[PDB]
Design a binder for this molecule. Structure first.
Ligand SMILES: COc1cc2c(cc1OC)[C@H](CCc1c[nH]c3ccccc13)N(C=O)CC2
Ligand SMILES: COc1cc2c(cc1OC)[C@H](CCc1c[nH]c3ccccc13)N(C=O)CC2
Ligand SMILES: [Mg+2]
Ligand SMILES: [Mg+2]
Ligand SMILES: [Zn+2]
Ligand SMILES: [Zn+2]
Lengths: 318, 323
């Protein structure tokens, strides 16, 4: 039953696809609602639960059901992954309840209205989105704008009972977190994380200034965004299938328009498995090794699964 | 009359061009006629194969999208920044330094750098939960908008003045223009000025004695600060020009403050027509913003800008003498 699967809401590797099916393609709504109850967020911020559900449904509706990866299931997955990373013991008592709400809300909206093509595609096709956003974090700026504008629909302002200062602080943190999910910022984000681990102070990690605390929240949601290869293989393999479909559909549009095919987007010359191994070796493992170092060692189980999954994918390559 | 306008446009290479008289003589088209004059002067139509009717059509559409009912951030301000940037480009310290494409980018960025400005600040737009601030996530809200509108108008009928640039030329120009206009966000001024000071302290010059700028970062930084200086050049102009710009920015500030007061908001600095000192605010503006910026630019191009800096210091003393 849907209720039984949700008991694992606090566990890495929740059966996200089964929850999507058992909720009638509403995992973002049911999982966000469950997170808000587990962290006592409706009462702490006086969010009418009907307003929460109405916003959540409207937000889920603006994820595209015909986009194979960047849809409402991905959003639900990043939300729940973030939720688990927030309860890392080494980050215990680090973030305020407003910051926790910030990270979770940001996770929920961080890909809304994604068209299934990359920023570079939007720039190179002279899209309306790239013209609006001057080629800079084109998607991420749009995800934020849509995620905030939907708060203005009827009975959707889940922040109505926040103070004016709380709303302003929340809005800034959400913007800083979602802008950091732009993959063109990964290396800089990683470097900041590495610097934090070399200068790491511990009693449990002590982060005194907002600059360091938002840095952790950015890398956290970024880690959640790039957490597919750290999940149990059966979940990882479905995410791989979905991202390859989206990449191949983008490559068909690049091909039909006569554009240079983006990396991993040519269905006629792609090694799905080799790309996964390179994705892990160059992006996901460096990131999660640093995150694990930061919270040494509450992430060892995550790092272990990632390395198991990398081993398995390598073994599929003759 | 076109004869009188033609005479006034003979000053287009001069600091302190009568830009308000050109606005009146051109039938409120200072941006169109000054851009057209400058493109003719720099041979840009021939260099970039820009059809004259396309240039005029774009310019008129662009000028149309400045607000005629905003006292400062209007098409006269845009024409002024264009013309000032045009003079700064000709400074001896930069002779043969920038390519035709970079000159085109700086001048085009100046022309569009405030288009569709509503006459209120970024902070006002953020604080009132404006659609603009919601679109741009509170980050360089106006400046992102000026760019988006300025580029979008190139798509209107017979408006693509870059139709004959190669694809890489358009790509390069687009990025430079974005880099330059985003740097006109006043919240970037301190970091921009800090970088300019570092460049001055580490400046290299070539055999001919011009600035050596051998990488994108340095070249774009000079163009960013050039256009920023032009944008903040009002107090460096002959006093009769400067005082008109002061009258206009203050009217715009006071109208914002009226909206803030009516909304029960705290009034922004310099926006309260009942607790304002025009003269002290100009002196603080020069002392904390304009003179540190222009003194640094003058150091970068020394001694090319000494007369402009002298005028700025004279005008500062004049305003101070009225307190
Ligand atoms: C499950 O597998 C994937 C998941 C995701 C991606 C790629 C996957 O598998 C190859 C790409 C990575 C984009 C990317 C940017 N720089 C890179 C450098 C190397 C590799 C990829 C990238 N995403 C796009 O939104 C995030 C989700
Ligand atoms: C001719 O006079 C003016 C012209 C301009 C301004 C102010 C003027 O006069 C006080 C303001 C400056 C805003 C500003 C940002 N930080 C500051 C610190 C101190 C003072 C002002 C500012 N502008 C607004 O678009 C640019 C043009
Ligand atoms: Mg994204
Ligand atoms: Mg401006
Ligand atoms: Zn994502
Ligand atoms: Zn301006």
């Amino acid at each position: 039953v849907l209720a039984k699967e949700l008991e694992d809401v606090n566990k890495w590797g929740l059966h996200v696809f089964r929850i999507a099916e058992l909720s009638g393609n509403r995992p973002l709504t049911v999982i966000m609602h469950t997170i808000f109850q587990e962290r006592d967020l409706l009462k702490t911020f006086k969010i009418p639960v009907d307003t929460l559900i109405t916003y959540l449904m409207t937000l889920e509706d603006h994820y595209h059901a015909d986009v194979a990866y960047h849809n409402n299931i991905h959003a639900a997955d990043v939300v729940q992954s973030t939720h688990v990373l927030l309860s890392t013991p080494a980050l215990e008592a680090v973030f305020t309840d407003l910051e926790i709400l910030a990270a979770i809300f940001a996770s929920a909206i961080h890909d809304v209205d994604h068209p299934g093509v990359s920023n570079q595609f939007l720039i190179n096709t002279n899209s309306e989105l790239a013209l609006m956003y001057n080629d800079s974090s084109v998607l991420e700026n749009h995800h934020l704008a849509v995620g905030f504008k939907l708060l203005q629909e009827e009975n959707c302002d889940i922040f109505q009972n926040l103070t004016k200062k709380q709303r302003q602080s929340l809005r800034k943190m959400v913007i800083d977190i979602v802008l950091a999910t732009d993959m063109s910022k990964h290396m800089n984000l990683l470097a900041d994380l590495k610097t934090m681990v070399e200068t790491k102070k511990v009693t449990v990690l002590l982060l005194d200034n907002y600059s360091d605390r938002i840095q952790v929240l950015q890398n956290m949601v970024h880690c959640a965004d790039l957490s597919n290869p750290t999940k149990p293989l059966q979940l990882y393999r479905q995410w791989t299938d979905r991202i390859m479909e989206e990449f191949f559909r983008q490559g068909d549009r690049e091909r039909e328009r006569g554009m240079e095919i983006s990396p991993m987007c040519d269905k006629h010359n792609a090694s799905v498995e080799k790309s996964q191994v390179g994705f892990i070796d160059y992006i996901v493992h460096p990131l999660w090794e640093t995150w694990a170092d930061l919270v040494h060692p509450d992430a060892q189980d995550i790092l272990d699964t990632l390395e198991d999954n990398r081993e398995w994918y390598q073994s599929t390559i003759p």
